[PDB]
Structures are given as structure tokens and as C-alpha cells.
Amino acid sequence: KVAPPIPHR
Amino acid sequence: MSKLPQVKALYPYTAANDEELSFKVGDIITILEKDEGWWKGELNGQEGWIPNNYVKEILEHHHHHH
Amino acid sequence: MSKLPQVKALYPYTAANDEELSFKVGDIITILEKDEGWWKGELNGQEGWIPNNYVKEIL
């Protein structure tokens, strides 16, 4: 249930 | 009229700044524009950029096929 | 975090062509762009032009 990291962008 | 793409939020998100759009799980967000990694969405009169890996675009039957 | 105007339909409208958006009384439409008498609206994922006298702005 972990959010992924946001797109490094 | 034309049908814009829609997405359903898989995870909640909190806008890091005023250009981004916060949302909750299950929210149905209409997409106005796609960039790399970030899409511009509209939900309940609020518009902003969202991380595109937080959402899943809903299958439609006009512009895709397999 | 930008607020878009939202409007409520006063009357039903049937789109006269493919660029217009049909709607029913009561529908709450989000406005994306304005050109004089016609405003570009979005309702349940459908986008198109509507007559601005058929709707009323929400607070």
C-alpha cells in the first residue's frame, strides 16, 4: 500500500 | 462533443504546490493535457498537474483497439 | 489548484454539430475556455461548446 515516487520530472 | 481521457486515482496525492492537483483514491480525473510523467487534470472544478503513475487511464473504445 | 468556473444549466441543449456539448437542466458544467457567446464546457468527460445564456454561474 506504498505510493510510488512521483516522476522525477 | 469530444470525449476527453479519464483516469482513476490509485493512491491519494497531495499537491506539492499550486500548479498541482490533489486527489483521493477512486477520484475520476479528466485529462486536459499529457506531458512526460505529469498530466494536467480537472476534478470538481480544480485543475492542475498530477503524477501519471498515481492513476490508471480508463479503457475507451474510439481511439484504442487490440 | 486553479479553480475553473462551473455553471448550472437553466435549459436543456442539444448540440447542433460535433463541436457542441449537449446537456440537461441541472447539469453542472466546468468551463475551460470562453469565446464571446459560446463557452467551452466539460461534463462527464465530454467537451464542447455551449451557449452561455443557457447556463448560470455557480458561487
Author numbering:
A (entry chain E): 33 to 41
B (entry chain B): -1 to 64
C (entry chain A): -1 to 57
What does the paper say about this structure?
Even in simple eukaryotes like yeast and amoebazoa, myosin I exists in several isoforms, which carry out distinct functions but the genome of E. histolytica has a single isoform of myosin I, namely EhMyosin IB.
We were able to crystallize EhMySH3 in complex with the pseudo-symmetrical peptide P2 [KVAPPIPHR]. Peptide, P2 is located between 653–661 residues in the c-terminal domain of the EhFP10 molecule. P2 was observed to make more electrostatic interactions with chain B than with chain A. P2 binds to EhMySH3 chain B in class II pattern, i.e., [xPxxPx(K/R)]. P2 residues A3 and P4 formed the first XP motif, which fit in the first consensus hydrophobic pocket made by residues Y9 and Y52 of EhMySH3; and I5 and P6 formed the second XP motif, which occupied the second hydrophobic pocket made by residues P49 and W36 of EhMySH3. The c-terminal residue R9 of P2 was observed to interact with residue E34 of the n-Src loop present in the specificity pocket of EhMySH3. In our case, though the electron density for the terminal R9 residue was not complete, after refinement we obtained better electron density near the n-Src loop, though there could be an alternate conformation near E18 in the RT loop, likely to be one of the probable orientations for residue R9.
